[PDB]
Design an enzyme around this catalytic site. Structure first.
Site, PDB file in Angstrom:
ATOM      1  N   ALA A  29      -2.826  -3.398  -3.985  1.00  0.00           N
ATOM      2  CA  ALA A  29      -4.240  -3.702  -3.794  1.00  0.00           C
ATOM      3  C   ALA A  29      -4.643  -4.955  -4.559  1.00  0.00           C
ATOM      4  O   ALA A  29      -5.356  -5.812  -4.026  1.00  0.00           O
ATOM      5  CB  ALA A  29      -5.099  -2.512  -4.216  1.00  0.00           C
ATOM      6  N   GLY A  65      -2.952   3.800  -7.009  1.00  0.00           N
ATOM      7  CA  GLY A  65      -1.546   3.449  -7.007  1.00  0.00           C
ATOM      8  C   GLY A  65      -0.901   3.651  -8.365  1.00  0.00           C
ATOM      9  O   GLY A  65      -1.552   3.590  -9.408  1.00  0.00           O
ATOM     10  N   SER A  88      -5.784  -1.316  -8.243  1.00  0.00           N
ATOM     11  CA  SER A  88      -6.298  -0.085  -7.663  1.00  0.00           C
ATOM     12  C   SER A  88      -6.269   1.033  -8.697  1.00  0.00           C
ATOM     13  O   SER A  88      -5.525   0.986  -9.681  1.00  0.00           O
ATOM     14  CB  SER A  88      -5.483   0.328  -6.432  1.00  0.00           C
ATOM     15  OG  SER A  88      -4.161   0.707  -6.786  1.00  0.00           O
ATOM     16  N   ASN A  90     -10.324  -6.467   2.591  1.00  0.00           N
ATOM     17  CA  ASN A  90     -10.123  -7.449   1.535  1.00  0.00           C
ATOM     18  C   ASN A  90     -10.958  -8.704   1.747  1.00  0.00           C
ATOM     19  O   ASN A  90     -11.423  -9.302   0.770  1.00  0.00           O
ATOM     20  CB  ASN A  90      -8.643  -7.804   1.426  1.00  0.00           C
ATOM     21  CG  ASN A  90      -7.811  -6.645   0.921  1.00  0.00           C
ATOM     22  OD1 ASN A  90      -8.336  -5.715   0.312  1.00  0.00           O
ATOM     23  ND2 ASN A  90      -6.508  -6.695   1.169  1.00  0.00           N
ATOM     24  N   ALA A 106       6.259   2.451  -8.464  1.00  0.00           N
ATOM     25  CA  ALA A 106       5.881   3.582  -9.299  1.00  0.00           C
ATOM     26  C   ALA A 106       5.644   4.860  -8.506  1.00  0.00           C
ATOM     27  O   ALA A 106       5.328   5.892  -9.110  1.00  0.00           O
ATOM     28  CB  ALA A 106       4.624   3.242 -10.105  1.00  0.00           C
ATOM     29  N   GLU A 114     -20.773 -13.813 -21.111  1.00  0.00           N
ATOM     30  CA  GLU A 114     -22.128 -13.626 -20.603  1.00  0.00           C
ATOM     31  C   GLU A 114     -22.231 -12.419 -19.676  1.00  0.00           C
ATOM     32  O   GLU A 114     -23.312 -11.829 -19.552  1.00  0.00           O
ATOM     33  CB  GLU A 114     -22.589 -14.899 -19.890  1.00  0.00           C
ATOM     34  CG  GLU A 114     -24.084 -14.970 -19.622  1.00  0.00           C
ATOM     35  CD  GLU A 114     -24.565 -16.391 -19.388  1.00  0.00           C
ATOM     36  OE1 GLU A 114     -23.771 -17.329 -19.636  1.00  0.00           O
ATOM     37  OE2 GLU A 114     -25.732 -16.565 -18.962  1.00  0.00           O
TER      38      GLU A 114
HETATM   39  N1  LIG Z   1      -9.321  -2.311  -0.610  1.00  0.00           N
HETATM   40  C1  LIG Z   1      -7.994  -2.238  -0.623  1.00  0.00           C
HETATM   41  N2  LIG Z   1      -7.381  -1.100  -1.092  1.00  0.00           N
HETATM   42  C2  LIG Z   1      -6.031  -1.016  -1.110  1.00  0.00           C
HETATM   43  C3  LIG Z   1      -5.241  -2.064  -0.661  1.00  0.00           C
HETATM   44  N3  LIG Z   1      -3.947  -1.693  -0.796  1.00  0.00           N
HETATM   45  C4  LIG Z   1      -3.905  -0.446  -1.321  1.00  0.00           C
HETATM   46  N4  LIG Z   1      -5.191  -0.013  -1.506  1.00  0.00           N
HETATM   47  C5  LIG Z   1      -5.634   1.268  -2.075  1.00  0.00           C
HETATM   48  O1  LIG Z   1      -4.962   1.430  -3.308  1.00  0.00           O
HETATM   49  C6  LIG Z   1      -4.536   2.763  -3.487  1.00  0.00           C
HETATM   50  C7  LIG Z   1      -3.025   2.778  -3.681  1.00  0.00           C
HETATM   51  O2  LIG Z   1      -2.674   1.798  -4.631  1.00  0.00           O
HETATM   52  P1  LIG Z   1      -1.557   0.670  -4.347  1.00  0.00           P
HETATM   53  O3  LIG Z   1      -2.049  -0.696  -4.764  1.00  0.00           O
HETATM   54  O4  LIG Z   1      -1.163   0.670  -2.891  1.00  0.00           O
HETATM   55  O5  LIG Z   1      -0.294   1.158  -5.227  1.00  0.00           O
HETATM   56  P2  LIG Z   1       0.462   0.188  -6.270  1.00  0.00           P
HETATM   57  O6  LIG Z   1      -0.508  -0.403  -7.261  1.00  0.00           O
HETATM   58  O7  LIG Z   1       1.207  -0.888  -5.515  1.00  0.00           O
HETATM   59  O8  LIG Z   1       1.481   1.134  -7.090  1.00  0.00           O
HETATM   60  P3  LIG Z   1       2.778   1.869  -6.467  1.00  0.00           P
HETATM   61  O9  LIG Z   1       2.544   3.362  -6.489  1.00  0.00           O
HETATM   62  O10 LIG Z   1       3.964   1.553  -7.346  1.00  0.00           O
HETATM   63  O11 LIG Z   1       3.027   1.401  -5.052  1.00  0.00           O
HETATM   64  C8  LIG Z   1      -4.964   3.528  -2.250  1.00  0.00           C
HETATM   65  O12 LIG Z   1      -6.160   4.194  -2.570  1.00  0.00           O
HETATM   66  C9  LIG Z   1      -5.240   2.455  -1.220  1.00  0.00           C
HETATM   67  O13 LIG Z   1      -6.280   2.824  -0.347  1.00  0.00           O
HETATM   68  C10 LIG Z   1      -5.855  -3.220  -0.188  1.00  0.00           C
HETATM   69  O14 LIG Z   1      -5.185  -4.169   0.217  1.00  0.00           O
HETATM   70  N5  LIG Z   1      -7.231  -3.295  -0.172  1.00  0.00           N
END
Ligand SMILES: Nc1nc2c(ncn2[C@@H]2O[C@H](COP(=O)(O)OP(=O)(O)OP(=O)(O)O)[C@@H](O)[C@H]2O)c(=O)[nH]1
Ligand SMILES: Nc1ncnc2c1ncn2[C@@H]1O[C@H](COP(=O)(O)OP(=O)(O)CP(=O)(O)O)[C@@H](O)[C@H]1O
Ligand SMILES: Nc1nc2c(ncn2[C@@H]2O[C@H](COP(=O)(O)OP(=O)(O)O)[C@@H](O)[C@H]2O)c(=O)[nH]1
Ligand SMILES: [Ca+2]
Ligand SMILES: [Ca+2]
Ligand SMILES: [Ca+2]
Ligand SMILES: [Mg+2]
Ligand SMILES: [Mg+2]
Ligand SMILES: [Mg+2]
Lengths: 334, 437, 423, 54
Positions: free
Chosen positions: B12, B143, B140, B228, B99, B254
């Site tokens: 994310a 994740g 995020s 995004n 992870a 600020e």
């Molecule tokens: N708004 C938005 N949310 C995202 C995006 N990609 C993943 N998410 C959200 O992020 C959460 C999952 O986190 P990720 O970023 O995919 O996982 P990670 O940080 O790569 O960690 P890992 O478990 O190792 O894959 C879920 O709730 C998804 O809906 C994105 O491109 N845009």
């Protein structure tokens, strides 16, 4: 096949509403903690509004307006009427009230003007933690009894029914739906005192006090409850007027005034969940046929004869309007 | 001029960062090859855009950004994307296995093996800075990397850059697009061990972005690219004062000064308007009064909640477009006499306003329509605590049965960290209720 | 490049494994000689999860074929896709296991397990990032059951931090080879409770009922049964073989599907099951996908509760309509999903459908009703064991009665654990 | 309704409108927590290999 939950078991109103929903064969009751519901007959205290409207693919509806307690609390109603310019302190249908824990010196300011001016100086102290109420003409007795309470001017000249020379109050049920349409139930009740009014039990017209402390309970009318047909007939035979003209016009005015006042604060028009709520308005009538607002109940009960009609109307205009299946109200337009 | 370093962690964070820097280049007129024709000081300068871009002797404007992901497939998109020429490989850090949506796996197991490499690459960007402001951390909540490794990085940044500010852009979990059941665990675990290390965090609930995309953009099933591009607009509104001439929110300090009086309560609510579909050939341009009134509609907030049932501690209005102070004050007076805007007793009832005359930039061919004026409101409402209540409740439901806890304990995390983190959220939720009622 | 090492052991394991590679080689455009002849780069994007790349752009399955008899593996090497398997990856004995768990696990199989592990080690050393292993086998025989679970134990000892995933065929008196099948299954289930992270319970009783009742096959064969297993195995591995974001690898699938380490036995389901040119609508896919008649474990889900659910839709359909139908099944039968795991149903969509279908649906459920399978096996076990019937086949291989008493207790515990979360 | 602190420039302006007056762990400790988790992982793996050895 809509889903609903029940989180207030003691709700005599919505126990019947939940009973009618299942009778339609199109509503399925879930466990009280299942979040995959369409309708929540929620609890009175600490309803988790912050968790509503976050279920994907679920139009969620709750039977209480978040923030309506500002209207359904003694001290909150006083503060709402004094501070809102839509109602103003120049409010003509609410008795002169004060909040004491503050407005102690303000309460004694108008109390001295009545004592000196030979006018009626009888007040009444009550609070939301009651079944504990005091009625006195000395302010020193009211303030010592409190030691949050509210003190308002006791209506010393009430409209007394004959025969009996007895006090009463009018309970109006009002339903506000998700679109904020104000529906006044056409059927009201007069909770009458069975004892003669002595300005020297017969003062408190509560249904529990008249059945426990009064000896003439059920003498004139059944259950100390007189419905609108009998009351209107009496107004025609005794005062040569109708219930609609002498009283019910002011009632509809007060209901519209209070609800339109808090509408910006509680409306769920663009919110992620919708709300409706059944309200109980308590009115006092004086000998001049002037209506006074006493209090607003947020979790009201109902008259036994009117449970059937009203609870069905709650399903018609408040529940089935949002969740259609396969008038007893007066719409107060605004 | 004081520099800002952006850190993008997890899928994310990287994809949102990818969309932001694309928007930054369109706004500052930087081409994908790194060139910027309007920059007459070749190879240096202390302009406002230099707080986000360094300059090479060849005229390339390189983002002051680091991309970190425990899996190469997302950052490999940046390596071959449209703006691949902007970044040099030192800024892109990838691992082998991710992870697996496990906070403990990203914080303890895998994080410990990569925390020194990331910090070392961050140190390279810090050495090019003559006066580093601090960091903007995109991640995020749900994740495993975005929650677990971020909280370890935020801890170490407080150690290695103690005097520097740290701002978060956090993605709150929403089941309509979420990919894991245990995301409530990861959200609360990471909020706990990051709370004392973040000065100001902007939460974006995917549920809100999803419905704004469906309702206003008429996207039937929005994708991450839809989400995004809308998020980067809000992010741009927030960081525009750091990248352009101005006087409101001119440095990271600020943000805390204007939005965060209580350090724990550092989660301002963001509301954006207008969001107009580009498929509409001709849409009526909303006025200053109309877009400002929309800042108090829940349907335009980045987190669904009801600010009417809460109190304000601060409020900033960031306008971009054809806006003059006269029309702003005219709108605020009207809104005061129509909305429920209660401030706390120990704060002035007012608005800090920032206007940038350049109208918002939209990605050519995207879903957002070009508008003549737009506004992003940053308000610190206690009503945002509703999002904590939802999160904490889902936590309590699973943790009562110890569901999925073995995955975390298997990574060396103690079970007590669960209840220690939950107790912190209960404390945070209690602070909001005291300030709010 | 998260590679998976496939292993098929025993007669059933190798026949089902061979059809699996025949099915997914078709979906990825790989011909029987290993040459790619597809028309979409989506077929190659995650091709390395299951296939190695050789000289001349050849795609070699990362599969190891194990048996104690040459018989079935000779038929694989002569089968439709026999030439595609790496010849060194055929590891076989000559004695057989005689449907005897003790021979596969303790005597005959111990002699061969080391040469299997040598081939596993060679495949793993050439893995950029080995994520784990998948094993196909039956529990009712000797090699796949006894030696399979011996392999799993040794694979875990050498690769303790990798996911172990199995497709395990449960015996049924409806489709039975020998009466000792409940013995072999009870001994293997305890091994699986300890040494796997994910197990797809493929019940031959369900496969028979589906062929007889639904597909209208009066006399089903093992081929007819394996046709259902192919479609199921292809469906549950779609998220591993194609670009997606739900349960894209084995560890994330385990994190979303397994709330308690021992309750990792899934009910697979597939739709449609047609006895055929009619287009199947999205509501129809979702209704069949959750119906018991499409479940491969022969357990009534209405007799238990769903801990977690994984649903995968394949084909070109309305993803919006997919969400509405999935949200409709949950919101109309929410009494069967546990309320203490919020949002425990995850939906995936893939554009490439299986061979010969416009669209399909695959169901992966972690239901507490799977205890009916274990109860069923436990009853058949006790029926013979209380009289020590047929036990001599095992004591003659060195086993003691105490090991059977312990395996019986272990499985009744597994049933008790499912019952405590059903309430 | 008071407007204060008006700052103007070429690319925009900013001001404040008032409506009503009012009424860390060390690197050592982080390394200890990280290594404590690795040791608990190592101990859990040792017990597994001890279990598989039996
Ligand atoms: N708004 C938005 N949310 C995202 C995006 N990609 C993943 N998410 C959200 O992020 C959460 C999952 O986190 P990720 O970023 O995919 O996982 P990670 O940080 O790569 O960690 P890992 O478990 O190792 O894959 C879920 O709730 C998804 O809906 C994105 O491109 N845009
Ligand atoms: N200002 C006033 N003048 C005269 N009588 C009054 C009065 N305020 C209250 N009363 C009398 O006291 C009685 C009780 O008032 P109140 O409505 O506060 O009780 P309550 O709220 O416990 C009953 P409920 O809430 O169930 O309708 C009323 O029936 C009314 O007749
Ligand atoms: N579905 C299916 N089940 C099979 C097949 N072959 C054998 N079985 C089942 O597997 C069990 C016998 O195991 P088997 O594989 O023959 O023993 P092994 O070769 O020694 O491991 C019995 O319960 C059979 O019902 C097959 O091709 N398909
Ligand atoms: Ca320059
Ligand atoms: Ca700090
Ligand atoms: Ca021998
Ligand atoms: Mg009351
Ligand atoms: Mg990731
Ligand atoms: Mg056989």
């Amino acid at each position: 096949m809509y889903t609903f939950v029940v989180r207030d078991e003691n709700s005599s109103v919505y126990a019947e509403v939940s009973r009618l929903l299942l009778a339609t064969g199109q509503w399925k009751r879930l466990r009280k903690d299942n979040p995959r519901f369409n309708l929540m007959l929620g609890e009175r205290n600490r309803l988790p509004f912050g968790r509503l409207g976050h279920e994907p693919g679920l139009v969620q509806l709750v039977n209480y307006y978040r923030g309506a307690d500002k209207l359904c609390r003694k001290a909150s109603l006083v503060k709402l009427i004094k501070t809102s310019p839509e109602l103003s302190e120049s409010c003509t249908w609410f008795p002169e009230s004060y909040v004491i824990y503050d407005e102690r010196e303000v309460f004694l300011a108008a109390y001295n003007r009545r004592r000196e001016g030979r006018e009626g100086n009888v007040w009444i102290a009550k609070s939301s933690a009651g079944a504990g109420i005091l009625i006195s003409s000395e302010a020193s007795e009211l303030l010592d009894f409190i030691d949050v309470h509210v003190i308002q001017k006791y209506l010393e000249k009430p409209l007394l029914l004959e025969p009996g020379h007895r006090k009463f109050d009018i309970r109006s049920w009002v339903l506000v739906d998700h679109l904020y349409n104000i529906y006044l139930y056409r059927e009201g009740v007069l909770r009458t005192s069975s004892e003669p009014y002595n300005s020297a039990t017969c003062h408190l017209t509560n249904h529990c006090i008249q059945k426990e402390y009064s000896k003439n309970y059920g003498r004139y009318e059944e259950g100390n409850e007189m419905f609108f047909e009998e009351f209107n007939q009496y107004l025609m035979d005794a005062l040569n007027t109708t219930l609609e003209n002498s009283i019910l016009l002011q009632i509809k005015h007060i209901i519209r005034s209070c609800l339109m006042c808090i509408e910006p604060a509680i409306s769920t028009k663009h919110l992620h969940y919708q709300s409706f709520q059944l309200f109980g308005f308590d009115f006092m009538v004086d000998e001049e046929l002037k209506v006074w607002l006493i209090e607003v109940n947020g979790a009201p009960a109902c008259a036994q004869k009117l449970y059937a009609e009203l609870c069905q109307g709650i399903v018609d205009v408040a529940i089935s309007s949002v969740f259609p299946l396969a008038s007893i109200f007066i719409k107060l337009h605004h | 001029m004081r520099e800002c370093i952006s850190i993008h962690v997890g899928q994310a964070g990287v994809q949102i960062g990818n969309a932001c820097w694309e928007l930054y280049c369109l706004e500052h007129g930087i081409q994908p090859d790194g060139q910027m024709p309007s920059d007459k000081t070749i190879g240096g300068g202390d302009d406002s855009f230099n707080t986000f871009f360094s300059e090479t002797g060849a005229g390339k404007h390189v983002p002051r950004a680091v991309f970190v992901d425990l899996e190469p497939t997302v950052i490999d998109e940046v390596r071959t994307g449209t703006y691949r020429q902007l970044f040099h490989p030192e800024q892109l850090i990838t691992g082998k296995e991710d992870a697996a949506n496990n906070y403990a796996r990203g914080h303890y197991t895998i994080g410990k093996e990569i925390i020194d490499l990331v910090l070392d690459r961050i140190r390279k960007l810090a050495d090019q800075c003559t006066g580093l402001q601090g960091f903007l951390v995109f991640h995020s909540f749900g994740g495993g990397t975005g929650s677990g490794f971020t909280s370890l990085l935020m801890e170490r940044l407080s150690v290695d850059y103690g005097k520097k500010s740290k701002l978060e852009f956090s993605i709150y979990p929403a089941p309509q697009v979420s990919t894991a059941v245990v995301e409530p665990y990861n959200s609360i675990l990471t909020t706990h061990t990051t709370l004392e290390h973040s000065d100001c965090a902007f939460m974006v609930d995917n549920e809100a972005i999803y419905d704004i995309c469906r309702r206003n953009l008429d996207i039937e099933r929005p994708t991450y690219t839809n989400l995004n591009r809308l998020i980067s607009q809000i992010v741009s509104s927030i960081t525009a004062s750091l990248r352009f001439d101005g006087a409101l929110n001119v440095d990271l300090t600020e943000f805390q000064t204007n939005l965060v009086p209580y350090p724990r309560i550092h989660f301002p609510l963001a509301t954006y308007a207008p969001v107009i579909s580009a498929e509409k050939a001709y849409h009526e341009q909303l006025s200053v009064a109309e877009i400002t009134n929309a800042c108090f509609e829940p349907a335009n907030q980045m987190v669904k909640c009801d600010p009417r049932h809460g109190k304000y501690m601060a409020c900033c209005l960031l306008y971009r477009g054809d806006v003059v102070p006269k029309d702003v004050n005219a709108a605020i007076a009207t809104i005061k006499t129509k909305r429920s805007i209660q401030f706390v007793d120990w704060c002035p009832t007012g608005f800090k306003v920032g206007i940038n005359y350049q109208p918002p930039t939209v990605v050519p061919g995207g879903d957002l329509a070009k508008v003549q004026r737009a506004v992003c409101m940053l308000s610190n409402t206690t009503a945002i605590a509703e999002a904590w209540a939802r999160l904490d409740h889902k936590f309590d439901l699973m943790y009562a049965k110890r569901a999925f806890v073995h995955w975390y304990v298997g990574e060396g995390m103690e079970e007590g960290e669960f209840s220690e983190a939950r107790e912190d959220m209960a404390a945070l939720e209690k602070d909001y209720e005291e300030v709010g009622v | 490049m998260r590679e998976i090492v496939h292993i098929q052991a025993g007669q059933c394991g190798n026949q089902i494994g061979a059809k699996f590679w025949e099915v997914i080689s078709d979906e990825h455009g790989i011909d029987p000689t290993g040459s790619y002849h597809g028309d979409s780069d989506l077929q190659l994007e995650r091709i390395n999860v299951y296939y190695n790349e050789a000289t001349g752009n050849k795609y070699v399955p990362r599969a190891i074929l194990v048996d104690l008899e040459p018989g079935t593996m000779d038929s694989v090497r002569s089968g439709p896709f026999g030439q595609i398997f790496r010849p060194d990856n055929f590891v076989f004995g000559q004695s057989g296991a005689g449907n005897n768990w003790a021979k596969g696990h303790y005597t005959e199989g111990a002699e061969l397990v080391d040469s299997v592990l040598d081939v596993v080690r060679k495949e793993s050393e050439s893995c950029d990032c080995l994520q784990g292993f998948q094993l196909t086998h039956s529990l009712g025989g000797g090699t796949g059951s006894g030696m399979g679970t011996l392999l799993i134990s040794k694979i875990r000892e050498e690769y303790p931090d990798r996911i172990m995933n199995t497709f395990s065929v449960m015996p049924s008196p409806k489709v039975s080879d020998t009466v000792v099948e409940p013995y072999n299954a009870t001994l293997s289930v305890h091994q699986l409770v300890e040494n796997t992270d994910e197990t797809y319970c493929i019940d031959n009783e369900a496969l028979y009922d589906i062929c007889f009742r639904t597909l209208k096959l009066t006399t089903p064969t093992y081929g007819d049964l394996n046709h259902l297993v192919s479609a199921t195995m292809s469906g549950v591995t779609t998220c591993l073989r194609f670009p997606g974001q739900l349960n894209a690898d084995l560890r994330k699938l385990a994190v979303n599907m397994v709330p308690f380490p021992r309750l990792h036995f899934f009910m697979p389901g597939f739709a449609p099951l047609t006895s055929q040119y009619r287009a199947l609508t999205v509501p129809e896919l979702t209704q069949q996908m959750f119906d018991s008649k499409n479940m491969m474990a022969a357990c009534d889900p209405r007799h238990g509760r769903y801990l977690t659910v994984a649903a995968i839709f394949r084909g070109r359909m309305s993803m919006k309509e997919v969400d509405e139908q999935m949200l409709n099944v949950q919101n109309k039968n929410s009494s069967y999903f546990v309320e203490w795991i919020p949002n425990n149903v995850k939906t995936a969509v893939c554009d490439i459908p299986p061979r010969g279908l416009k669209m399909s649906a695959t169901f992966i459920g972690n239901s507490t009703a799977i205890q009916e399978l274990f109860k069923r096996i436990s009853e058949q076990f006790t029926a013979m064991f209380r009289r020590k019937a047929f036990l001599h086949w095992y004591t003659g291989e060195g086993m003691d009665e105490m090991e059977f008493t312990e395996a019986e207790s272990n499985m009744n515990d597994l049933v008790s654990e499912y019952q405590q979360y059903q309430d | 309704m008071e407007v204060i602190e008006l700052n103007k420039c070429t690319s925009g302006q900013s001001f404040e409108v008032i409506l009503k007056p009012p009424s860390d762990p060390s690197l050592e400790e982080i390394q200890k927590k990280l290594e404590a988790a690795e040791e608990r992982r190592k101990y859990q793996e040792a017990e597994l290999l001890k279990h598989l050895a039996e």
